[PDB]
Every structure is written in C-alpha cells, then in structure tokens.
Amino acid sequence: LENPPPPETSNPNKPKRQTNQLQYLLRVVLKTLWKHQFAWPFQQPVDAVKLNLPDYYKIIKTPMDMGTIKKRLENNYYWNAQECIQDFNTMFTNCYIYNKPGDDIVLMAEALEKLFLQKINELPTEE
Ligand SMILES: CCS(=O)(=O)Nc1cc(-c2cc(NC3CCNCC3)c(=O)n(C)c2)cc2c1ccn2C(C)(c1ccccn1)c1ccccn1
Numbered sequence: 001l002e003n004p005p006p007p008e009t010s011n012p013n014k015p016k017r018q019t020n021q022l023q024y025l026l027r028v029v030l031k032t033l034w035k036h037q038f039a040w041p042f043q044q045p046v047d048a049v050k051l052n053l054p055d056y057y058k059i060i061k062t063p064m065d066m067g068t069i070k071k072r073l074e075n076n077y078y079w080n081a082q083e084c085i086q087d088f089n090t091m092f093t094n095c096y097i098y099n100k101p102g103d104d105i106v107l108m109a110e111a112l113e114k115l116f117l118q119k120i121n122e123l124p125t126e127e
Pocket residue numbers: 040041042043044045046047048050051053094095098099104105
C-alpha cells in the first residue's frame with residue numbers, strides 16, 4: 001500500500017482572515033507543542049510505508065498531524081478557531097484508537113494533550 005497524500009493545507013477558494021484566536025493557536029499553542037520533547041512523531045503525517053505499518057490507513061480515515069496543522073494556520077486555511085482545535089483533537093483521538101492504552105506513543109500524546117488543554121483554557125478574547 002502507498003501512503004495517502006497528506007491532508008490539504010492550502011485552498012484559495014476558501015475566504016481568509018486573521019483573528020486573535022487563530023494567531024494564538026499558531027504563536028502559542030502550536031509553538032508550545034512543536035518544541036516539546038515528544039512532538040517529533042506528530043510533526044508530519046504517519047509514514048506508513050517507511051514504518052512498515054500497512055494497516056494504519058486501513059483504520060485511520062481522518063489522519064491529522066501538527067505539520068499539517070502548522071501549514072493550515074500559515075496558509076489561513078481555518079476561518080474559525082474551533083476548526084483548528086478539532087484537528088488537534090483528531091490527531092490525539094487517532095493515536096488513542098490505533099494504539100493500546102499505556103503504549104509509549106499514547107503516553108507521548110497524553111503529555112502533549114495536557115499542555116494543549118492548558119493553552120486552550122487561555123484562548124484570548126474573540127472579536
Ligand atoms: C514523523 C512521522 S513518521 O515519519 O511516521 N515517524 C514516526 C511516527 C511514529 C508514530 C507511530 C504510531 N503508531 C505506532 C503503531 C505501532 N507501535 C508503535 C506506534 C502513531 O500512532 N503515531 C502518531 C506516530 C513512530 C515512529 C516514527 C519513527 C520512529 N517511530 C518509532 C520509533 C516510535 C514508536 C513509538 C513511539 C515513538 N516512536 C516506531 C516504533 C515502532 C514502530 C514504528 N515506529
């Protein structure tokens with residue numbers, strides 16, 4: 001099995017805006033998770049070909065990763081903050097579905113998700 005193409009990250013047919021909350025999601029939330037010790041398996045799509053994990057995209061039909069989220073934020077792909085928060089949540093739940101509770105990758109994702117939730121509780125005031 002091939003890898004799937006990565007999720008779309010640019011679309012000029014989508015209106016674009018800058019907002020307080022989107023700027024925070026890139027400059028604070030994504031930046032804080034990205035520089036964490038455990039970010040690295042989540043910084044790009046799961047490369048099922050390289051990892052010899054041919055079952056990965058047989059089960060995970062909404063893949064998501066922080067590389068994709070970073071590029072979506074940089075390309076103004078999201079209009080609403082919740083569209084970006086949904087993508088972080090998808091990344092975490094994908095990990096929790098594929099991998100057994102307590103597995104190394106799950107403990108890494110849980111350490112990132114704790115920090116994510118703290119930063120989402122500090123989202124700035126909407127326009
Ligand atoms: C940047 C994305 S990538 O190119 O796809 N690279 C990598 C991604 C991932 C990874 C693996 C997952 N699932 C597997 C399922 C089988 N058991 C292990 C976890 C997963 O859900 N996510 C989100 C990311 C692990 C990686 C590497 C590279 C090395 N590892 C290993 C060493 C790994 C394993 C566990 C925890 C952390 N790292 C690895 C070990 C065994 C098999 C595959 N990868």
